[PDB]
Amino acid sequence: XLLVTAGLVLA
Amino acid sequence: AIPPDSWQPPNVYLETSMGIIVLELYWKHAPKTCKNFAELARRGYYNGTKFHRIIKDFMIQGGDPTGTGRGGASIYGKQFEDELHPDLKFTGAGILAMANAGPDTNGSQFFVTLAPTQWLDGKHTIFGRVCQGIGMVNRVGMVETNSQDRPVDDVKIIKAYPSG
Ligand code: NA
């Protein structure tokens, strides 16, 4: 999907 | 040591392989986050790095010197706190904000939005916006990416620096 992570990127 | 609070360069420039983006910082709302970003830029920490993750009509993400998306560190010696404000919302393109891995996990990675992204409200520190170069940012957002949302041709930050 639409996240802005750092390490575990999600859908 | 960290710069003194008196040091508030109004701008950070990103000289990218596609041109210059002029960011203006929200020192009042996000003093710790602005200090971090401007100081990392001043140190050359972002020089030669890339936007490792770009998603059309969403955002461009960078700030990791390893380029993996897993790295980067702040000027504080530890990941630092969010500086959230209900009245700073993700209302449109050009907003500068921190990437993270949960609450109070700010490092060096950041993003610039390409459209409204209000589902991020209250989860990422907003600490500035594009004053000049939004046309460039719009174009950067359209670059072809692979299945991992990595640009197929590197979009580099050649140099980043605060106002002198
Ligand atoms: Na202070």
Residue numbers in the entry:
A (entry chain B): 1 to 11
B (entry chain A): 3 to 166
What did the study's authors say about this model?
Peptidyl-prolyl isomerase like 1 (PPIL1) is a cyclophilin and belongs to the so-called Prp19-related proteins. PPIL1 is a single domain cyclophilin and has been found to interact with the Ski-interacting protein (SKIP, also referred to as hPrp45, SNW domain-containing protein 1, nuclear receptor coactivator NCoA-62). Peptidyl-prolyl cis/trans isomerases (PPIases, E.C. 5.1.2.8) catalyze the isomerization of peptide bonds that precede a proline residue and can thereby facilitate folding of their substrate proteins. Second, PPIL1 can interact with the SKIP protein without involving its PPIase active site.
The crystal structure of PPIL1 in complex with the inhibitor cyclosporine A (CsA) was obtained at a resolution of 1.15 Å and exhibited two bound Cd2+ ions that enabled SAD phasing. The final model comprises full-length PPIL1 protein (except the very N-terminal Met) bound to CsA without any geometry violations and with good R-factors. PPIL1 exhibits the canonical cyclophilin fold comprising an eight-stranded antiparallel β-sheet capped on both sides by α-helices. All CsA-contacting residues of PPIL1 are conserved and exhibit the same side chain rotamers as observed for CypA in complex with CsA, rendering the active site geometry essentially identical to CypA and other CypA-type cyclophilins. The structure of the PPIL1·CsA complex contains two Cd2+ ions in an asymmetric unit. Both ions are coordinated by the PPIL1 protein and water molecules such that contacts between two neighboring PPIL1 molecules in the crystal lattice are established. were able to pinpoint a number of PPIL1 surface-exposed residues that undergo chemical shift perturbations upon titration with SKIP59–129. Strikingly, these residues (highlighted in Figure 4B) involve the residues His87, Asp89 and Cys133, which coordinate Cd2+ ions in the present crystal structure. Cd2+ ions are directly involved in crystal packing and it appears, thus, that Cd2+-mediated crystal packing has excluded the SKIP peptide from the crystals. The PPIL1·CsA crystal structure exhibits a generally more compact shape compared to a previously published NMR structure ensemble of PPIL1. In particular, the N-terminus of the protein is not disordered as reported for the NMR structure.
